Design an enzyme around this catalytic site. Sequence first.
Site, mmCIF file in Angstrom:
data_model
loop_
_atom_site.group_PDB
_atom_site.id
_atom_site.type_symbol
_atom_site.label_atom_id
_atom_site.label_comp_id
_atom_site.label_asym_id
_atom_site.label_seq_id
_atom_site.Cartn_x
_atom_site.Cartn_y
_atom_site.Cartn_z
ATOM 1 C CB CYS A 130 -1.951 1.666 -3.087
ATOM 2 S SG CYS A 130 -0.621 0.543 -2.656
ATOM 3 N N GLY B 233 -1.945 -2.008 -7.767
ATOM 4 C CA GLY B 233 -3.011 -1.100 -8.074
ATOM 5 C C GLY B 233 -4.013 -0.942 -6.965
ATOM 6 C CG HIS C 13 2.878 4.987 -1.918
ATOM 7 N ND1 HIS C 13 2.207 4.267 -0.952
ATOM 8 C CD2 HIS C 13 2.457 4.492 -3.103
ATOM 9 C CE1 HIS C 13 1.429 3.364 -1.533
ATOM 10 N NE2 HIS C 13 1.548 3.493 -2.840
HETATM 11 C C1 LIG Z 1 -0.018 -0.415 -4.079
HETATM 12 N N1 LIG Z 1 -0.893 -0.445 -5.034
HETATM 13 C C2 LIG Z 1 1.034 -1.503 -3.785
HETATM 14 N N2 LIG Z 1 2.034 -1.061 -2.804
HETATM 15 C C3 LIG Z 1 3.040 -0.230 -3.040
HETATM 16 O O1 LIG Z 1 3.192 0.318 -4.155
HETATM 17 C C4 LIG Z 1 3.958 -0.009 -1.833
HETATM 18 C C5 LIG Z 1 4.673 1.343 -1.890
HETATM 19 C C6 LIG Z 1 6.121 1.054 -2.216
HETATM 20 C C7 LIG Z 1 6.316 -0.451 -2.233
HETATM 21 N N3 LIG Z 1 5.032 -1.028 -1.765
HETATM 22 C C8 LIG Z 1 4.750 -2.308 -1.310
HETATM 23 O O2 LIG Z 1 3.631 -2.661 -0.968
HETATM 24 C C9 LIG Z 1 5.758 -3.452 -1.164
HETATM 25 N N4 LIG Z 1 6.949 -2.824 -0.596
HETATM 26 C C10 LIG Z 1 7.588 -2.766 0.596
HETATM 27 O O3 LIG Z 1 8.578 -2.071 0.688
HETATM 28 C C11 LIG Z 1 7.230 -3.537 1.887
HETATM 29 F F1 LIG Z 1 7.331 -4.865 1.789
HETATM 30 F F2 LIG Z 1 6.018 -3.277 2.364
HETATM 31 F F3 LIG Z 1 8.088 -3.173 2.848
HETATM 32 C C12 LIG Z 1 5.893 -4.391 -2.419
HETATM 33 C C13 LIG Z 1 4.973 -5.596 -2.178
HETATM 34 C C14 LIG Z 1 5.410 -3.818 -3.762
HETATM 35 C C15 LIG Z 1 7.332 -4.894 -2.595
HETATM 36 C C16 LIG Z 1 5.776 1.759 -0.918
HETATM 37 C C17 LIG Z 1 6.120 3.241 -0.826
HETATM 38 C C18 LIG Z 1 6.000 1.086 0.429
HETATM 39 C C19 LIG Z 1 0.535 -2.906 -3.397
HETATM 40 C C20 LIG Z 1 -0.403 -3.052 -2.377
HETATM 41 N N5 LIG Z 1 -0.846 -4.262 -1.975
HETATM 42 C C21 LIG Z 1 -0.392 -5.354 -2.565
HETATM 43 C C22 LIG Z 1 0.590 -5.358 -3.597
HETATM 44 C C23 LIG Z 1 1.091 -6.544 -4.200
HETATM 45 C C24 LIG Z 1 2.023 -6.450 -5.197
HETATM 46 C C25 LIG Z 1 2.510 -5.198 -5.621
HETATM 47 C C26 LIG Z 1 2.061 -4.042 -5.053
HETATM 48 C C27 LIG Z 1 1.073 -4.080 -4.019
#
Ligand code: A1ASG
Lengths: 306, 306
Positions: free
Chosen positions: B145, B143, B41
Amino acid sequence: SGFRKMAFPSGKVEGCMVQVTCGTTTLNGLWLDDVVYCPRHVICTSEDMLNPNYEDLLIRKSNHNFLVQAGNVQLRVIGHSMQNCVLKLKVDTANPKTPKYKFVRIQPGQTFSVLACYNGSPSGVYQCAMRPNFTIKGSFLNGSCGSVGFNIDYDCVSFCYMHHMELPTGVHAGTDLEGNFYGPFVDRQTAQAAGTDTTITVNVLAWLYAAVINGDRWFLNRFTTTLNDFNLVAMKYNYEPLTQDHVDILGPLSAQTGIAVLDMCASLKELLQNGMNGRTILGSALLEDEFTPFDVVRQCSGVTFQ
Amino acid sequence: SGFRKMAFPSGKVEGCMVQVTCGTTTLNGLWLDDVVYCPRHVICTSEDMLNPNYEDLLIRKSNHNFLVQAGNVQLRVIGHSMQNCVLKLKVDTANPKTPKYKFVRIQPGQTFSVLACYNGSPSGVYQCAMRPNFTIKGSFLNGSCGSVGFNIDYDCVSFCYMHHMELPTGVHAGTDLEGNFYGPFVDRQTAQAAGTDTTITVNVLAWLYAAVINGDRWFLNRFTTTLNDFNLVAMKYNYEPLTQDHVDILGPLSAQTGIAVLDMCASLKELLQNGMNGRTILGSALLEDEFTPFDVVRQCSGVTFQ
Ligand SMILES: *C(=N)[C@@H](NC(=O)[C@@H]1[C@@H]2[C@H](CN1C(=O)[C@H](NC(=O)C(F)(F)F)C(C)(C)C)C2(C)C)c1cncc2ccccc12
Ligand SMILES: *C(=N)[C@@H](NC(=O)[C@@H]1[C@@H]2[C@H](CN1C(=O)[C@H](NC(=O)C(F)(F)F)C(C)(C)C)C2(C)C)c1cncc2ccccc12
């Protein structure tokens, strides 16, 4: 989100761990530049560790009585001296993996990471707090003496703890890296015991803020209290007093959640007087006191180290 | 003695973490030999991550759209491909710090260490279990991921987890290192949710053995029970069934304490039916299920890694 008891990455410290042998005693040493630091009780034997005279014991030793093993290489000891309760073993090679470092002494209530080691090989890493009674609730077996505790501030390792002994209650005691014990413990085999502990109030409040930040809010209330009326309750439940400096340190967390520090104290009062009533906070059914306000900001905001 | 949630030393993994940027998305990658692994992603944009077609998105990318940062050095990407939900970025330099490693997929109920990272820089290390519902209760912000989960078996890093997303309950979901998700989660932004969890029974029993080994015995009793009558109680309290293979795996701990596995089950029955009555076990007022029998033997016997 989420909240875990999180240690610092241990790599920078792993590259400093060595094995020190003297006689039939093997333990761990910490190799920085051309010095290896290790607990002085390494020079003792079973009948020595009863009531030893370390100046006497050390004058009878030679450089060649100390075997230092850096992985599968032989370090030649070229000098030895005692500094309080640690030995400093001068070796003929500077550790090429020496990080930028400091020797700092921490306060009861502060946290650090421990790299438990056996025979100079790192085994695991975990997070501890220095208890108000100067012990730490560690996880340590035979051979673990000389493992160190540390924090990392950007790229610099602040070493604060070297392990020396386990007390009868199963808790642990040791020294700072200049060899001065935390608390009233001595490196000899007496009947010494921990002594009474307290709960670290400011840390509990910090952890309650971590819980709000992570969506646990059931313990919140519209009540407030005064600092003096809170500290009356703290004393009765063997929590330590909250100071204005603690209130100030909790300011950022207060601001971020919109929950005034004294409001959160009122929440703590109620938790102490009623318990939790079968509910949990951040996966715990106990009030947790081993996260500092810094630890909480760290983990609920995301700082790294390089 | 003592019992802590203990992670593996993280050094061997720290030397593999890099920063991967594509467009305005930055996350972490894992650099082994001349390949960097990261969540696919990364090639998505805000409006892409709604319902993406990754084959379409990836064919429109070029090697030069991927910026790989290994500390303060520039890695040139020379190839890219998709493997399930991870990207494999071929780079022109083999990681000189590549440890001996394997890619393994773990079972719900097993544990691993997580090295949380931001912008390719490791931030902290902690221990997680794969929940029965294939989520992990991690600690992860924007960040993070591409941070990975791993175990260490002597000198060899078995990578088992790469972080992809946080679910609405605050728990985390990700993939094995071949890109296959744990559980029924997809790397797209749907309304997906965790699904119902259970307690990992064999782990609770292991942790009760750790408590006996460390001097907590108040929950012991002269009672025993049959495996079938225990599993009736387990089902009602949403614990998972105990099998004969679990009884066998608990054999060493049974032998070491002298407490028969089924006797300890009877103790667990009583704890589930009565609660703890204001007492604690190993510093917890909850039954802990994120230590495996292996973890307990590890920490209550002292194995290292080199
Ligand atoms: C990575 N650094 C980050 N995660 C993401 O960017 C992923 C990515 C996009 C949305 N996402 C999420 O983790 C969820 N989204 C969802 O759709 C869910 F809930 F899992 F179904 C959000 C929490 C951002 C809404 C895709 C392609 C699934 C990440 C990783 N861990 C924690 C965290 C906390 C806040 C923001 C981003 C996080
Ligand atoms: C180090 N690897 C080991 N500790 C010691 O060898 C020190 C050392 C000798 C005895 N000792 C102890 O930790 C205590 N002894 C005490 O006298 C006490 F309780 F602290 F007052 C023992 C637990 C061995 C009885 C001296 C000079 C104080 C060590 C470190 N951590 C844990 C642990 C567990 C078991 C055995 C040894 C352990």
